[PDB]
């Protein structure tokens, strides 16, 4: 480096498609694709980016409208332009180019490559932008550094990372929330991300993504997943709970970080239709039993209110109406199987389904249900046939279900006897107790 | 869009 002003002048490093970083993992689109950020703001007007040497590399510059607000008289969940992260992406080539920039932005490469470590750095020098700088805890940064660039930030956004997490938040609520604490507050949101990191089995399987996970402000909705990451609502409101970096870890706040989290990390083979909010929160219930948070199970009573709903119900998995009770078995079979020797149970068995589960769509991700009983008994050599049976996993009947899409399932008698033959092929011995009766 | 939600 040296090439000039700090952030203005830059070398970027190739990243891993975070699209292919999603698709190995089984968890599709959620990884940053703004990673790659400038610290540089460029105001209204012609611009002017120079590029090193390419070697013919496919580079990219993103200008997001992260301040984009609904229209004057616009309710913000019935905005037209939608709750998506609307960005110009301008392709760059090697030597001078001439940037036309309607909307003042705050700028992020876009350098991906399917040979990650064999990449050229490409310098990018901003001859006409102002340096924000952002927040970086990996290169060493402090609490002093986080004051300096909230008191000298020239756009209304501030861009920080940690090892995993990736922030785009205003300026005025950072100062207002925030305050000094930038540290502890990138440090409370990798701690959140490698909870859900842990619990994937990422760790121990060598599988810890290089990809942030990008948190951004919105001004349309309170909290929600999509496939640029978590979005925020940036009120008082929202932002007290997330940007607050005691708040952050505690109680409904700290489930809803992980809970929108979950979604990023949530696996096709454990998300079959009916489970898009249900999968996500054993990273909750995980987050709070880590930050010393109380079980939202035990809280609501959830296990009675589950084991009447479909157990004593004797209705199917599929039938049941509450997101809370269809998350009561997932979350049980963690509690009995970490407690009696198999401490890396969900690391395991989402190993065992990223390695084992099929490739389905719409109405065939019914068969998800099945692999994922098959991947429980494997990994821990137990036939939880009585288990899975007392909570509805193998009735047999046509199930609709509304999540986001319709979903017609047809479980067939011969699918649920190809499982349960499968499991008893194994010989693996029974648990001693029911695991059906495990209360909090 | 592909929101994923919660509705408090
Ligand atoms: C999604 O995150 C939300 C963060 O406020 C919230 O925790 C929500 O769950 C809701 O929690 C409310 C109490 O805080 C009510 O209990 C409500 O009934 C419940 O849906 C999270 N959703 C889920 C499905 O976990
Ligand atoms: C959050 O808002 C979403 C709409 O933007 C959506 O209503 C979602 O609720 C989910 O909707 C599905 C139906 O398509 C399922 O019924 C699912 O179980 C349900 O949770 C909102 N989240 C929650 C947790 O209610
Ligand atoms: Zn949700």
């Known amino acids: 480096g040296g090439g000039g002003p700090d952030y203005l002048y830059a070398e970027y490093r190739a990243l891993p498609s975070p699209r292919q970083t999603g698709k190995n993992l089984r968890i599709?689109?959620?990884?940053?694709?703004?990673?790659?950020?400038?610290?540089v703001y460029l105001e209204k007007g012609r611009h002017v980016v120079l590029v090193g040497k390419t070697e013919?590399?496919?580079?990219?510059?993103?200008?997001?409208?992260?301040?984009?607000?609904?229209?004057?008289?616009?309710?913000?969940?019935?905005?037209?332009?939608?709750?998506?992260?609307?960005?110009?992406?301008?392709?760059?080539?090697?030597?001078?180019?001439?940037?036309?920039?309607?909307?003042?932005?705050?700028?992020?490469?876009?350098?991906?490559?399917?040979?990650?470590?064999?990449?050229?750095?490409?310098?990018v020098?901003?001859?006409?932008?102002?340096?924000?700088?952002?927040?970086?805890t990996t290169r060493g940064?402090?609490?002093?550094?986080?004051?300096?660039?909230?008191?000298?930030?020239?756009?209304?956004?501030?861009?920080?990372?940690?090892?995993?997490?990736?922030?785009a938040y205003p300026v005025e609520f950072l100062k207002k929330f925030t305050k000094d604490r930038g540290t502890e507050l990138i440090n409370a949101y990798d701690k959140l991300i490698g909870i859900q990191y842990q619990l994937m089995g990422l760790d121990?399987?060598?599988?810890?993504?290089?990809?942030?996970?990008?948190?951004?402000?919105?001004?349309?909705?309170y909290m929600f997943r999509d496939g640029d990451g978590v979005a925020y609502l940036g009120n008082d409101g929202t932002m007290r709970m997330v940007?607050?970096?005691?708040?952050?870890?505690?109680?409904?706040?700290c489930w809803g970080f992980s809970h929108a989290v979950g979604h990023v990390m949530q696996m096709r083979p454990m998300t079959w239709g009916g489970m898009?909010?249900?999968?996500?929160?054993?990273?909750?219930?995980?987050?709070?039993?880590?930050?010393?948070?109380?079980?939202?199970?035990?809280?609501?009573?959830?296990?009675?209110?589950?084991?009447?709903?479909?157990?004593?119900?004797?209705?199917?998995?599929?039938?049941?109406?509450?997101?809370?009770?269809?998350?009561?078995?997932?979350?049980?079979?963690?509690?009995?199987?970490?407690?009696?020797?198999?401490?890396?149970?969900?690391?395991?068995?989402?190993?065992?389904?990223?390695?084992?589960?099929?490739?389905?769509?719409?109405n065939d991700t019914v068969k998800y249900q099945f692999e994922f009983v098959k991947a429980c008994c494997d990994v821990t050599k137990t036939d939880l046939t009585d288990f899975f049976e007392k909570w509805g996993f193998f009735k047999p009947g046509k199930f609709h279900i509304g999540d986001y899409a319709q979903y017609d399932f047809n479980v067939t008698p011969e699918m649920v006897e190809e499982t349960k033959k499968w499991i008893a092929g194994k010989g693996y011995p029974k648990p001693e107790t029911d695991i059906t009766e495990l209360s909090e | 869009t592909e929101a994923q939600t919660t509705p408090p």
């Open chain 1, 276 to 362: 898009t909010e249900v999968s996500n929160n054993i990273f909750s219930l995980q987050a709070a039993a880590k930050t010393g948070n109380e079980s939202r199970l035990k809280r609501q009573g959830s296990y009675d209110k589950a084991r009447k709903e479909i157990i004593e119900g004797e209705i199917a998995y599929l039938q049941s109406k509450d997101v809370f009770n269809k998350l009561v078995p997932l979350w049980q079979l963690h509690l009995y199987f970490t407690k009696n020797g198999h401490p890396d149970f969900y690391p395991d068995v989402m190993e065992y389904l990223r390695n084992n589960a099929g490739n389905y769509g719409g």
């Open chain 1, 125 to 136: 020098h901003f001859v006409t932008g102002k340096a924000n700088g952002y927040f970086d």
């Open chain 1, 204 to 221: 121990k399987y060598g599988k810890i993504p290089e990809n942030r996970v990008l948190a951004r402000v919105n001004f349309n909705y």
């Open chain 1, 56 to 123: 013919g590399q496919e580079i990219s510059l993103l200008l997001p409208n992260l301040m984009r607000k609904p229209a004057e008289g616009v309710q913000p969940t019935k905005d037209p332009n939608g709750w998506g992260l609307h960005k110009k992406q301008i392709p760059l080539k090697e030597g001078i180019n001439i940037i036309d920039v309607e909307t003042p932005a705050n700028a992020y490469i876009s350098y991906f490559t399917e040979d990650a470590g064999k990449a050229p750095k490409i310098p």
């Open chain 1, 141 to 167: 940064d402090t609490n002093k550094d986080w004051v300096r660039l909230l008191d000298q930030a020239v756009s209304p956004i501030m861009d920080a990372r940690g090892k995993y997490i990736q922030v």
């Open chain 1, 243 to 253: 940007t607050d970096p005691e708040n952050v870890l505690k109680g409904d706040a």
């Open chain 1, 28 to 39: 599709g689109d959620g990884f940053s694709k703004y990673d790659n950020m400038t610290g």
